[PDB]
Design a protein around this ligand. Structure first.
Ligand SMILES: N=C(N)c1cc(-c2cccc(NC(=O)C3(Oc4ccc(Cl)cc4)CCCCC3)c2)cs1
Ligand SMILES: N=C(N)c1cc(-c2cccc(NC(=O)C3(Oc4ccc(Cl)cc4)CCCCC3)c2)cs1
Lengths: 5, 236, 236, 5
């Protein structure tokens, strides 16, 4: 999964 | 509200304790109680709120993904019927996830966003609103899925418009908003080119503004810039 | 029981799904529902029950330790009074922990132990009874602390007596019981010499019986023997 | 902390 903050 | 009898300051203190104890459901309950006191949140308090619910919903999302994967396999050609249990339990986790999202969205709508006038608070809350509609979108399948997606898009877009007018390109809230809106484009909106364009443009505009920053601000901004690059590497 | 309307087999299936999703509170609730169907548990089912509650109470214990540590520091000479909040929140976690322990002990008393006639089930359940009284002992401070300790000791002792009569020295249940009873001696009963003696004797008697085992049984037994050695290295 | 199972 891609990075999110 | 079962937190209605506790002092606001005690709720914030206990949220920090719950964080140290990795008790994020408690943390979220304490910060919901703090929000429901009705006062605006400080910068630290906004981040306590976001950390708490991000951790709670993150665990729910991970569980949902495991269960959805098992459910898909049970439905492939060749599988042995195992009955309704996988679907039922995936639905149970999904409903709990939707409940948490609805709770957070409810706090933002009553009344955090409407009282948020400064860019750092308003962009932060609108980013959260986009994020939690995005999590609802991840599990949506009904008559409402397009509308959920458009609610996420609209919140992110308003946050983006404010951030480009009111914050420097290295502001970590602006960067994190762009990171997540880019993921929305890639994973939710089936717009990988928009996702890639947004991540790249955000990264390059930030790079050009790093020279203005202190060492500590530089560290904060470059951390999120590395996440943008990480996603771009994943996608190209 | 909110699980009273669900099929026993569906509860067991969902416990396994909850495990795969790392949803151990759900897992424990499903296995409590299965126990409350009133039938004896198979070997696999007993381990599902133990895995679920071990994970739940393990997290509570870790949180309690963090909070107890913060509380002790707040009470040292030189600290700034921070009010009742640390104590209150430690008490909250402690009460939830005690509730989980009481729930497990209640399942063992109604009526898992009394129906357990085979050594593998009876020793397993009495070990659990010792374990959950041990967790109660870890947080106990009142008129009842000695009695809680003696309840743990008594359950472990009955399990030990059965295991030495009815199981080989390499049986992993026998080994795990001895491991945990040894920790009880060291950490709860202030009997480090008993702890060390028990771990060493258990390890040596197991070593001498490994020659009787298949490769798969050997792997299971030597894994727990390594934990015994690990503790002995910690303590000497 | 010591190991338990
Ligand atoms: N956990 C607590 N007790 C407290 C946390 C804070 C706090 C205050 C300002 C900013 C951050 N930053 C962050 O958490 C991170 O960066 C963000 C987060 C969100 C966005 Cl929208 C953008 C970047 C999260 C991701 C990696 C880098 C750091 C934290 C005060 S108290
Ligand atoms: N998690 C599930 N779905 C299922 C687990 C099982 C199962 C059935 C028999 C035995 C074990 N063994 C264990 O879990 C371990 O060893 C023990 C545990 C307890 C004791 Cl009293 C002694 C040794 C735990 C510690 C390290 C080595 C392994 C598991 C069936 S299903």
């Amino acid at each position: 999964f891609p990075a999110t903050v | 509200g079962a937190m209605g009898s506790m002092e606001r300051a005690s709720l914030i203190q206990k949220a920090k304790l719950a964080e140290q104890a990795e008790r994020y459901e408690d943390m979220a309950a304490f910060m919901k109680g703090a929000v429901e006191k009705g006062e605006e949140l400080s910068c630290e308090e906004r981040n306590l709120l976001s950390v708490a619910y991000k951790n709670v919903v993150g665990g729910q999302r991970a569980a949902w993904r495991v269960l959805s994967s098992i459910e898909q396999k049970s439905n492939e050609e060749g599988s042995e019927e195992k009955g309704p249990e996988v679907r039922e339990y995936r639905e149970k986790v999904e409903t709990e996830l939707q409940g948490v999202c609805d709770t957070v969205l409810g706090l933002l709508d009553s009344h955090l966003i409407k009282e948020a006038g400064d860019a750092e608070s308003r962009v932060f809350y609108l980013k959260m609103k986009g994020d939690y509609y995005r999590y609802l979108a991840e599990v949506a399948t009904g008559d409402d899925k397009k509308r959920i997606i458009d609610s996420a898009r609209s919140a992110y877009q308003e946050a983006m418009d404010i951030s480009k007018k009111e914050m420097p390109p290295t502001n970590p809230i602006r960067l994190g908003l762009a990171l997540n809106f880019s993921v929305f484009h890639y994973e939710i909106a089936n717009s990988p080119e928009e996702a890639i364009s947004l991540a790249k443009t955000t990264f390059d505009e930030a790079m050009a503004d790093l020279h203005t920053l202190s060492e500590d601000s530089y560290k904060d901004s470059t951390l999120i810039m590395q996440l943008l690059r990480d996603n771009l590497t994943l996608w190209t």
